[PDB]
Amino acid sequence: MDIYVCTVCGYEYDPAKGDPDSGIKPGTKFEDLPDDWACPVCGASKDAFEKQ
Ligand SMILES: [Fe+3]
C-alpha cells in the first residue's frame, strides 16, 4: 500500500483508492501502474512520482 507523491503538484497516488478514471482499480500498487499513467491533477508522468 506504499503511497507515492507527484513531485510536480503534490497529488498523492494512494493504492487503496487506485485511479478509476485511468482504468486503475482500487488496490493497484504504484509499480503496477502502466508507464503511460499520468497525474490526474497536473498531467505529469508516472515517473515524476516519488515514495511519500
Ligand atoms: Fe501532479
Curated annotation (Swiss-Prot):
Its main location: cytoplasm. One of its GO terms (molecular function) is electron transfer activity. Its cofactor is Fe(3+). InterPro entries: Rubredoxin, Rubredoxin-like_dom, Rubredoxin_dom, Rubredoxin_ET, Rubredoxin_Fe_BS. Fe cation binds at C6, C9, C39, C42. Binds 1 Fe(3+) ion per subunit. PANTHER family: RUBREDOXIN, RUBREDOXIN-1-RELATED. GO terms for cellular component: cytoplasm. It is found in: Cytoplasm. Belongs to the rubredoxin family. The modification N-formylmethionine is found at M1. This is Rubredoxin. It comes from the Bacteria. The keyword Repeat does not apply. Keywords: Cytoplasm, Electron transport, Formylation, Iron, Metal-binding, Transport. GO terms for biological process: alkane catabolic process. Rubredoxin is a small nonheme, iron protein lacking acid-labile sulfide. Its single Fe, chelated to 4 Cys, functions as an electron acceptor and may also stabilize the conformation of the molecule. Residues 1-52 form the Rubredoxin-like domain.
